[PDB]
Amino acid sequence: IATPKGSSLGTPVNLAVLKLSEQGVLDKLKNKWWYDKGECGAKDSGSKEKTSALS
Amino acid sequence: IFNSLWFSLGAFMQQGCDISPRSLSGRIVGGVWWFFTLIIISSYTANLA
């Protein structure tokens, strides 16, 4: 996260990000916007592989 | 041409043939089709399982 140089906003943001990463708040959203918003489940599609007769 | 047609069916899977044109090309290439068709039934057994 980028603030301009010398801005006092960045240090509470520095306390914000290191808190949210510690609680897995990023990881829950990373689960959201990659897997829960994903058009596949990579193991849900991994649970879908059943083939058949010899060519 | 009608006598050995059964011996091609006698070379189809099993039942070893009584008439054998002992060692010329009909013996060898008659084994080649015989070699080929045994792959199909092993693959048939492998696919059905």
Tab-separated table of C-alpha atoms in Angstrom:
chain	number	residue	atom	x	y	z
A	1	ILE	CA	0.000	0.000	0.000
A	2	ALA	CA	1.461	3.303	-1.156
A	3	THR	CA	1.148	6.695	0.526
A	4	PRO	CA	3.113	9.775	-0.606
A	5	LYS	CA	6.463	10.347	1.051
A	6	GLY	CA	6.246	12.060	4.419
A	7	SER	CA	2.510	11.484	4.848
A	8	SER	CA	1.465	10.579	8.384
A	9	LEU	CA	-1.260	8.254	7.066
A	10	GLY	CA	1.166	5.471	6.174
A	11	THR	CA	2.201	4.438	9.684
A	12	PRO	CA	-1.367	3.587	10.864
A	13	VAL	CA	-1.706	1.817	7.502
A	14	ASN	CA	1.562	0.068	8.382
A	15	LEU	CA	-0.113	-0.977	11.624
A	16	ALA	CA	-3.254	-1.866	9.664
A	17	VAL	CA	-1.724	-4.216	7.078
A	18	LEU	CA	0.476	-6.041	9.584
A	19	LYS	CA	-2.624	-6.614	11.706
A	20	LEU	CA	-4.861	-7.832	8.870
A	21	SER	CA	-2.165	-10.135	7.493
A	22	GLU	CA	-1.677	-11.511	11.004
A	23	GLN	CA	-5.389	-12.294	11.341
A	24	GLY	CA	-5.633	-13.842	7.880
A	25	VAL	CA	-8.013	-11.115	6.698
A	26	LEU	CA	-6.053	-10.995	3.442
A	27	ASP	CA	-6.164	-14.788	3.202
A	28	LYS	CA	-9.949	-14.896	3.603
A	29	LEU	CA	-10.258	-12.337	0.808
A	30	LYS	CA	-7.609	-14.225	-1.163
A	31	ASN	CA	-9.846	-17.280	-0.786
A	32	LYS	CA	-12.731	-15.072	-1.931
A	33	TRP	CA	-11.425	-13.292	-4.997
A	34	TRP	CA	-9.399	-16.225	-6.320
A	35	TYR	CA	-11.312	-19.362	-5.351
A	36	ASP	CA	-14.787	-18.300	-4.259
A	37	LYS	CA	-14.983	-15.860	-7.173
A	38	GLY	CA	-13.142	-18.348	-9.367
A	39	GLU	CA	-14.980	-20.139	-12.145
A	40	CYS	CA	-13.384	-23.445	-11.081
A	41	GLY	CA	-12.467	-25.217	-7.896
A	42	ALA	CA	-9.054	-26.644	-8.800
A	43	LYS	CA	-9.749	-29.672	-6.615
A	44	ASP	CA	-13.463	-29.495	-7.402
A	45	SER	CA	-12.353	-29.918	-11.007
A	46	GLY	CA	-9.806	-32.357	-9.588
A	47	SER	CA	-12.776	-34.288	-8.204
A	48	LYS	CA	-14.222	-34.431	-11.754
A	49	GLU	CA	-12.150	-36.868	-13.816
A	50	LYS	CA	-13.875	-40.125	-14.855
A	51	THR	CA	-13.058	-41.535	-18.296
A	52	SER	CA	-14.078	-44.515	-20.378
A	53	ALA	CA	-13.632	-46.936	-23.324
A	54	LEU	CA	-10.428	-47.554	-25.287
A	55	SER	CA	-9.970	-45.697	-28.551
B	1	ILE	CA	-9.157	-71.493	-49.250
B	2	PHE	CA	-12.090	-72.841	-47.261
B	3	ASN	CA	-10.086	-75.484	-45.374
B	4	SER	CA	-7.647	-73.091	-43.685
B	5	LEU	CA	-10.288	-70.418	-43.046
B	6	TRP	CA	-11.240	-72.400	-39.949
B	7	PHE	CA	-7.549	-72.529	-39.021
B	8	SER	CA	-7.497	-68.744	-39.105
B	9	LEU	CA	-10.440	-69.022	-36.724
B	10	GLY	CA	-8.286	-71.731	-35.159
B	11	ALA	CA	-5.664	-68.996	-34.925
B	12	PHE	CA	-8.225	-66.444	-33.731
B	13	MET	CA	-7.573	-66.737	-30.008
B	14	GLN	CA	-6.733	-70.280	-28.896
B	15	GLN	CA	-7.109	-73.965	-29.965
B	16	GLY	CA	-3.735	-74.753	-31.549
B	17	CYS	CA	-4.105	-75.772	-35.174
B	18	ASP	CA	-3.592	-79.275	-36.517
B	19	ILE	CA	-2.693	-78.234	-40.074
B	20	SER	CA	0.604	-76.346	-39.872
B	21	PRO	CA	2.450	-75.198	-43.016
B	22	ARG	CA	5.538	-75.915	-40.955
B	23	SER	CA	8.111	-73.130	-41.389
B	24	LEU	CA	7.522	-71.007	-44.510
B	25	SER	CA	6.032	-67.500	-44.681
B	26	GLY	CA	2.510	-68.782	-44.032
B	27	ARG	CA	3.760	-70.134	-40.711
B	28	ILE	CA	5.477	-66.887	-39.731
B	29	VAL	CA	2.945	-64.323	-40.978
B	30	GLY	CA	0.152	-66.613	-39.823
B	31	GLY	CA	1.750	-66.078	-36.432
B	32	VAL	CA	1.908	-62.316	-37.030
B	33	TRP	CA	-1.875	-61.901	-37.256
B	34	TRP	CA	-1.932	-64.365	-34.362
B	35	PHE	CA	0.499	-62.110	-32.465
B	36	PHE	CA	-1.707	-59.094	-33.201
B	37	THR	CA	-5.056	-60.531	-32.119
B	38	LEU	CA	-3.822	-61.563	-28.665
B	39	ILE	CA	-3.150	-57.920	-27.852
B	40	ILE	CA	-6.789	-57.070	-28.567
B	41	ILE	CA	-8.249	-59.634	-26.022
B	42	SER	CA	-5.726	-58.713	-23.290
B	43	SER	CA	-6.692	-55.093	-23.961
B	44	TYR	CA	-10.331	-56.219	-23.935
B	45	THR	CA	-9.760	-57.756	-20.510
B	46	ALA	CA	-7.898	-54.655	-19.338
B	47	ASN	CA	-10.574	-52.259	-20.591
B	48	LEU	CA	-13.535	-54.210	-19.205
B	49	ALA	CA	-11.875	-54.325	-15.790
